[PDB]
Write an enzyme that holds these catalytic residues in place. Sequence first.
Site, mmCIF file in Angstrom:
data_model
loop_
_atom_site.group_PDB
_atom_site.id
_atom_site.type_symbol
_atom_site.label_atom_id
_atom_site.label_comp_id
_atom_site.label_asym_id
_atom_site.label_seq_id
_atom_site.Cartn_x
_atom_site.Cartn_y
_atom_site.Cartn_z
ATOM 1 C CD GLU G 65 -9.660 -29.276 9.376
ATOM 2 O OE1 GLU G 65 -8.837 -28.651 8.674
ATOM 3 O OE2 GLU G 65 -10.136 -30.385 9.058
ATOM 4 N N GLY G 138 -7.971 -18.637 12.468
ATOM 5 C CA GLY G 138 -8.319 -19.007 13.848
ATOM 6 C C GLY G 138 -7.094 -19.423 14.622
ATOM 7 C CB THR G 173 -6.683 -16.671 1.180
ATOM 8 O OG1 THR G 173 -6.458 -16.797 2.580
ATOM 9 C CG2 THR G 173 -5.365 -16.466 0.455
ATOM 10 C CD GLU G 248 24.392 -13.337 19.867
ATOM 11 O OE1 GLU G 248 25.035 -12.270 19.778
ATOM 12 O OE2 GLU G 248 24.755 -14.306 20.566
HETATM 13 N N1 GTP Z 1 3.339 -21.435 2.812
HETATM 14 C C1 GTP Z 1 2.050 -21.592 3.145
HETATM 15 N N2 GTP Z 1 1.210 -20.549 3.514
HETATM 16 C C2 GTP Z 1 -0.094 -20.803 3.839
HETATM 17 C C3 GTP Z 1 -0.573 -22.106 3.811
HETATM 18 N N3 GTP Z 1 -1.867 -22.130 4.165
HETATM 19 C C4 GTP Z 1 -2.236 -20.872 4.432
HETATM 20 N N4 GTP Z 1 -1.171 -20.033 4.239
HETATM 21 C C5 GTP Z 1 -1.262 -18.582 4.462
HETATM 22 O O1 GTP Z 1 -1.880 -18.403 5.720
HETATM 23 C C6 GTP Z 1 -3.109 -17.710 5.633
HETATM 24 C C7 GTP Z 1 -4.153 -18.489 6.415
HETATM 25 O O2 GTP Z 1 -3.533 -19.645 6.924
HETATM 26 P P1 GTP Z 1 -3.849 -20.130 8.420
HETATM 27 O O3 GTP Z 1 -3.991 -18.936 9.329
HETATM 28 O O4 GTP Z 1 -2.742 -21.033 8.900
HETATM 29 O O5 GTP Z 1 -5.202 -20.989 8.314
HETATM 30 P P2 GTP Z 1 -5.746 -21.726 9.636
HETATM 31 O O6 GTP Z 1 -5.288 -20.994 10.872
HETATM 32 O O7 GTP Z 1 -5.267 -23.154 9.688
HETATM 33 O O8 GTP Z 1 -7.350 -21.649 9.525
HETATM 34 P P3 GTP Z 1 -8.248 -22.677 8.664
HETATM 35 O O9 GTP Z 1 -7.422 -23.754 8.000
HETATM 36 O O10 GTP Z 1 -9.066 -21.923 7.621
HETATM 37 O O11 GTP Z 1 -9.182 -23.320 9.656
HETATM 38 C C8 GTP Z 1 -3.473 -17.631 4.168
HETATM 39 O O12 GTP Z 1 -3.887 -16.328 3.837
HETATM 40 C C9 GTP Z 1 -2.200 -17.978 3.431
HETATM 41 O O13 GTP Z 1 -1.649 -16.800 2.897
HETATM 42 C C10 GTP Z 1 0.252 -23.139 3.445
HETATM 43 O O14 GTP Z 1 -0.179 -24.285 3.412
HETATM 44 N N5 GTP Z 1 1.547 -22.869 3.111
#
Ligand code: GTP
Lengths: 39, 44, 428, 428, 51, 54, 434
Positions: G65, G138, G173, G248
Amino acid sequence: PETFWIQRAPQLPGVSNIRTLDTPFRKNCSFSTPVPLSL
Amino acid sequence: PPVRLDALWHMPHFQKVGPHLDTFPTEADRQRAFKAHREECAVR
Amino acid sequence: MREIVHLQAGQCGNQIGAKFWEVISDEHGIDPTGTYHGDSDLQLERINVYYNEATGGKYVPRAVLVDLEPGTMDSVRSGPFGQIFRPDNFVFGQSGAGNNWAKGHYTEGAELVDSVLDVVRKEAESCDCLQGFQLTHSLGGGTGSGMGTLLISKIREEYPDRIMNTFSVVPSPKVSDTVVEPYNATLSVHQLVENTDETYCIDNEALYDICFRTLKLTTPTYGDLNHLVSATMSGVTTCLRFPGQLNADLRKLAVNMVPFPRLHFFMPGFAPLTSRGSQQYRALTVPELTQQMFDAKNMMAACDPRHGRYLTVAAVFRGRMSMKEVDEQMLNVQNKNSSYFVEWIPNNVKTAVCDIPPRGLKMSATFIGNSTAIQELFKRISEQFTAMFRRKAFLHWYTGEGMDEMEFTEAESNMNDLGNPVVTRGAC
Amino acid sequence: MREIVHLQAGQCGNQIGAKFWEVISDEHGIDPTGTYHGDSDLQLERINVYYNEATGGKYVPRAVLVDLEPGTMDSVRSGPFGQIFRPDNFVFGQSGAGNNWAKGHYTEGAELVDSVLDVVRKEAESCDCLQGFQLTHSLGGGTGSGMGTLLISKIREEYPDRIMNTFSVVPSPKVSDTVVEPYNATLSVHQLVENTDETYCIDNEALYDICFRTLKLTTPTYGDLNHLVSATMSGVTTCLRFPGQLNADLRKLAVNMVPFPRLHFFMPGFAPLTSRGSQQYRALTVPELTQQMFDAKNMMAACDPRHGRYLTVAAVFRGRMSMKEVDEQMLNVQNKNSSYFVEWIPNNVKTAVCDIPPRGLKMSATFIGNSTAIQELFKRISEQFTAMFRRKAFLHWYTGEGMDEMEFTEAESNMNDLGNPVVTRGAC
Amino acid sequence: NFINTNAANVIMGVAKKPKPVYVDKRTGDKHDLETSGLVPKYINKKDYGVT
Amino acid sequence: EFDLSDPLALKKDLPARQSDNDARNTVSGMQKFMGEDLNFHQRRKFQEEQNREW
Amino acid sequence: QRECISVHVGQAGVQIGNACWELYCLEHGIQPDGQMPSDDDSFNTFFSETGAGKHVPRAVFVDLEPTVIDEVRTGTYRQLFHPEQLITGKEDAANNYARGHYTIGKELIDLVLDRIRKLADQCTGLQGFLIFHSFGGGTGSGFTSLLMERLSVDYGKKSKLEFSIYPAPQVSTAVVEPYNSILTTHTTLEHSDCAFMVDNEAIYDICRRNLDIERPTYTNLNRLISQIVSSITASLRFDGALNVDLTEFQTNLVPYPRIHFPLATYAPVISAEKAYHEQLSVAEITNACFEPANQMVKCDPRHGKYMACCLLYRGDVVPKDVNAAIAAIKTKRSIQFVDWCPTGFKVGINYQPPTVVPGDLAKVQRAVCMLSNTTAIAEAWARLDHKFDLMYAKRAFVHWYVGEGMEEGEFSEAREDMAALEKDYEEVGMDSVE
Ligand SMILES: Nc1nc2c(ncn2[C@@H]2O[C@H](COP(=O)(O)OP(=O)(O)OP(=O)(O)O)[C@@H](O)[C@H]2O)c(=O)[nH]1
Ligand SMILES: Nc1nc2c(ncn2[C@@H]2O[C@H](COP(=O)(O)OP(=O)(O)O)[C@@H](O)[C@H]2O)c(=O)[nH]1
Ligand SMILES: Nc1nc2c(ncn2[C@@H]2O[C@H](COP(=O)(O)OP(=O)(O)O)[C@@H](O)[C@H]2O)c(=O)[nH]1
């Protein structure tokens, strides 16, 4: 008759083109008006 | 009192899964370690 | 870049989407004449989701404007944002709706659907990747039911892998503007079920209840009723239009909210709402947002969630906010209300946060809920249809336009075969 | 950090709470516009007990004003501190109780309690550690008795571990403002027993006694009668709201004040009271506070404690003051008056010392007393009830609302079941 | 029984053999694979090396 | 990020509709609607005198 | 000769990436334009001089995306990342592993593997490939699997760590997270090396109690994850006493084949005010890393036994004080340890004091980062299973997966191997009674 409609008339949803002045609730079927049948 | 649930619901279909890590020596050694696993996890 | 083809059928759908384009051009800084005059560069970053670029820096909304009465097109063209749509996109026919599903589905409606599809194909192949379609209509009555569901079927057949959101105004129990609302709704829900991906049921009962109990309006009218629907229309499609943390577009709401293909009927809600007298008493925070989202006074359908377990919930927040509050409040709702949520979907609440709020507001949030409680909305229509159908009332013109008794029986049977899954998933 | 949800039942309860909120707003420095205009930072230290924060530094009371007539809401809104309450928790009804416990408990009360419980649930949700609830009501009359006790029962259902402080205007013998106040009082005392945690019996007769003889007022008003009540409300819940040495909150007072789970009727008293012609001759010190506090003329209930035994006594002093004098002016009382105190509880007096005094006064104290002499009020109400019940009178408009004949009989049965364990302890 | 019908529907279904599309630029520009020359498609004909 | 962490944030935030004609409040900011009749009483007075006169 | 290609995949990644590469920059000087304001070669571990005095990040941000990566293509650091190293796509992946390892993910794989090769053909000695993702999304669970597998096909037995956001122990989330998470662990159980795990709920508390931030956002959290990536790579950028490379951590942590899920925990995470009253001494910093209230992965390490813990002391840490601390922690009978691991405490003492980003956290002249493989991660896998099963039972939200390319059966094979994983943690736990 002075109504809530005639106050808010140029902002109401179901009001056609206000080409005249006395009632905004006239009918102005000029945009619809298929092109073969139009003056 | 704040009582505890049993073990969390896992599938009764997936409770018969075999091993993928044969870290132990011989099989009797393994069950004799797991007997202590049962008895020590039993509290006190 | 992704984009959405907008469709609006019937007087109801036309007026609701007219207010929607008003709202979203207010958000994007588009003037009535089509050009741009705003303040931020984050507004034209994703303007190619709803506005096709024209010559001279003009942005024409991408919308197909369908009705069978040649007066609602005229009213839309003469409205507030009337000189912003394409004149070619004003597709109509000098005929009558007759608030008849048969006259909207097997007649001059089917004689107009080809020109409508030509316009839709223009706006759908003037693309690079299309996320999907957004049709707004009313089930009770003609055009929005007949033309709406026929357009639903043909567009779903032509484009089978695109998301599709239908905002349907469903008939209301206590008062009915037309007599044959149960007939039209029963014939339309059957096409709604096994075609669309996200169906939003908006009821006039809940709209007037937000107008009375929450907003305390003096003379609420259809402008404000459609304004409340444009609320959730703006709220749902915000992560693909403005940047955020943990974005979620239409398909990522649909995946998290549609557990089975038959269950996609939702109850929308938008909740930084307060009356003008209670405005100076507010303490606008994320817990207050969740408090207004999860009560059964802001949800925009006449279905009480106290009568059914929540299958899935989505919260699309819009503002600069801490994610800790959002995560802990969405956990706190689930923990404090245990019997109102299903157990077989653990943590059945989804979170999205966009940074840029609606203009003139610090912070907003929209609610979408797939719940068991969508029971009553189809049930009351089913008993009213059964009552009006046992005695053959208001049906001779339905069979005069070319229908049969078995299609009515199939529509009632499919209403019941929608009710029974949301019976059984409400009982483990 | 703790919180107190304040709820008001009836016209009398609404006026009592209006004067209470004027007193608390003055005490914390909150102006009628709702914002803060004070002199010390200790006022904002624990202001999140009676108030919740809003935008612009505006503190709003967490009070639910409840009445069955839309005539007292208008007066409270038109009062001096009227533009400080939320406009939403003015829960009225377009009906009338008409001085009827039946019409407070088993009628229109039953569907207005749902809206009040929604408001109370919202107010308790916006609190991390709720200490409890504080209901102001009149026992004799409609609304405050029936709706008050129904609300008490349902709040007890919803929240079991929170303190319930109930200020109750028990009806007087001397003068009567309602003929059916015996029926109302008898039906309300049972629900006050088998529910609440602390019940403060304030009496209009004793308020007139204080306002005529001690204050030497010429024409006392209900404003003065409510001022006396609000003084002891602040004096009771001031240790949890202002810092001090040997603090005592509501649960501490309840623990050290009820010996048995039913015996929670108390006799409040606030007595640094001087006339305006006697203020310049006052020698206000620690023994004077104790003697005016323990004199049987500054009591707030018509229950002469010299006719019974003080089961337990608590006192909350307010000011900067000396602790030998604190302990010694209570040890002197305990040893000088030995026959007015029970022997099975030695050292039966609880001490609290709030540091911040009531403003405009150097030094104050409040009193809570659980005594045998409160049985006088209950024998009197029981004799009134058994005078009016044997002739089966004032009764058709109690049985026609949904009650039964035997309900009065078990109300009287528990009403005299209170007769045993506050006479057995008075006679060992 | 809608649980059993949905379970049977998801159990007894083959998915897609999805259409191969490749993205060349950083932006995301999609192009079909067969019609483009970046695949062996016309090597495996029936008239290869023979009239 | 002290803006979303400030203890004095609520003492510097403003209500959404501070006045009856706020410039922030627009169609997007849903605190100003069209059915809230400011002109209700004057409209009724105008209608009543119209009725009277006619 | 110590370069480390970083492939950040998904919002979480692109976002932790922003935080990680800002710290990387402020540490070596590289300004938000590349041009280092010098008027020396340490930067090579992460940067690549063009010769015109421009230092380009050695990374490949990838997100099906747009949005997230696009805000990086128009922001403070818009001139650092070479355009073709920020590879976005057009359509998302709707929290559906399926459209991340099968459909809308197998299109960006070709180009990303391409860029990864060019950023490898310029390295004079690659150490590994630090992949940052989120177990619950995703791209996070989908593209990573495909990327990891295809990498193994090419770069064969080359190191491939995996900093990840493990599913939460209560918050979450998403409603479909459990599924994506179990599917991901399966395709990476044999293709990944040492996948570090940081839960968000945990950091949220560590920030409300130790860093005095009442309302933490993803950035406060992201920036703490950047301090961890620094300590793990500090040795190969700054001089020290006991250097620890990125080959390591796979040997002195991952014990038996499958088991490869170390957990992260940082030290001196104090907050100005509460630092005017603390001697942050080697011992204090160490004892803290073993406290069951700092483990950045809610998993009470007490309800399990330690298998291998590699500490990384960054700053002014007298080597003797380290030996002393590890000794004290060993005595403490509270902290446990498996029998098949007499020596279970690895130590790395670098010298460069933790860098202070103009933002949060205190300026500490000492800090540690522990990476233990506690058997107490079993509870987490069990909780993930309860979830996967509570849904798989009614084949809920599976239509979407079969609606991409995941043959229903795959869901079964996945949870079945996750059950094997749990049975493994039982064996590696039991202590030979002989
Ligand atoms: N530190 C940090 N953690 C994140 C952030 N965004 C998401 N997370 C964690 O990652 C989980 C999902 O993030 P992603 O798997 O990266 O979301 P994605 O793969 O980009 O999927 P979509 O954006 O919904 O299309 C969430 O449950 C958050 O806990 C971020 O911007 N910063
Ligand atoms: N929200 C909203 N609903 C409307 C509006 N105008 C009409 N409706 C609803 O539309 C329903 C009837 O519309 P319908 O007869 O189907 O119009 P048609 O499709 O052109 O035949 C009524 O029950 C109204 O409640 C509007 O402006 N806003
Ligand atoms: N202290 C005090 N008591 C009041 C006030 N107003 C009314 N009361 C008492 O309330 C009693 C009658 O009120 P009531 O009929 O019960 O009002 P209701 O509860 O709404 O039915 C009288 O006997 C008064 O003593 C007031 O302002 N202050």
